[PDB]
Amino acid sequence: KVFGRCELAAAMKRHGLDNYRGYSLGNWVCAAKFESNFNTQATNRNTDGSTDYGILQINSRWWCNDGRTPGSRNLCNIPCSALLSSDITASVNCAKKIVSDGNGMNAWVAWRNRCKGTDVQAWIRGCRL
Ligand SMILES: [Cl-]
Ligand SMILES: [Cl-]
Ligand code: NA
């Protein structure tokens, strides 16, 4: 699924991401924009042979099982394919674990390089939320 901006905002807010670990909704929408362009089916292969999945490009190196990242972990205890679903529940529940592991949203490189320190509230402006 390719979400609209406000559509995604509302889904994330419903799942409790707004202000989760102190990160306002616009941070999460900005991270999704630049990680996946709001597309739940986005996938991208990493240098080390792991793959990032879904709207928040969650990495198989640590967080999900894809069967093709030798030596990896599955800390969210899910198949990576669950992160491609039109229903973002699995991506949000796993992102809450990632953002809690110590480095907050710096876990997402696109958030650090394209959202951190910007007007992230622009990402939810206009939304009836
Ligand atoms: Cl915000
Ligand atoms: Cl933090
Ligand atoms: Na894995």
Gist of the model:
By secondary structure, the chain is mostly helical. The chain is built from four helices and three strands; from the N terminus they run H-H-E-E-E-H-H. It has a three-stranded antiparallel beta sheet with strand order 1-2-3.
Key features of this structure:
Lysozyme, binds chloride ion, 129 residues, monomer, 4 helices, 6% strand, 3-stranded antiparallel beta sheet, mainly alpha, binds sodium ion
Describe the 3D structure:
It is a single chain. By secondary structure, the chain is mainly alpha-helical. Strands 1-2-3 form a three-stranded antiparallel beta sheet. It has helices spanning 5-14, 25-36, 89-99, 109-114; strands at 43-45, 51-53, 58-59. The protein has a single domain, classed as Lysozyme (Orthogonal Bundle), CATH 1.10.530. The chain is globular. It has four helices and three strands, in the order H-H-E-E-E-H-H. Helix 1 crosses helix 2 (25-36). 30% of the residues lie in helices and 6% in strands. It binds chloride ion (2 copies) and sodium ion. One chloride ion (CL) binds at residues 24-26, 120-121, 124. Its main location: secreted. Keywords: Allergen, Antimicrobial, Bacteriolytic enzyme, Disulfide bond, Glycosidase, Hydrolase, Secreted, Signal. Belongs to the glycosyl hydrolase 22 family. Monomer. This is Lysozyme C.
Strand content: 5-15%
Q: Could you give the count of β-strands?
A: 3
Structural class given helices, strands, pairing? mainly alpha
The neighbouring-strand order within the major sheet is 1-2-3
Q: What is the annotated CATH architecture?
A: Orthogonal Bundle
Radius of gyration, whole Å: 14 Å
The distinct bound ligands, ions and cofactors come out as: chloride ion, sodium ion
- The SSE order reads HHEEEHH
* Overall number of structural domains: 1
Largest sheet: 3 strands, antiparallel
Secondary structure tally, helices: 4
The CATH topology comes to Lysozyme
Please give the alpha-carbon distance between the first and last residues: 20 Å
CATH class: Mainly Alpha
Shape: globular
The helix fraction, in percent, is 25-40%
GO biological process, one term: defense response to bacterium
Keywords: Allergen, Antimicrobial, Bacteriolytic enzyme, Disulfide bond, Glycosidase, Hydrolase, Secreted, Signal
Pfam families: Lys
InterPro entries: Glyco_hydro_22 (IPR001916), Glyco_hydro_22_CS (IPR019799), Glyco_hydro_22_lys (IPR000974), Lysozyme-like_dom_sf (IPR023346)
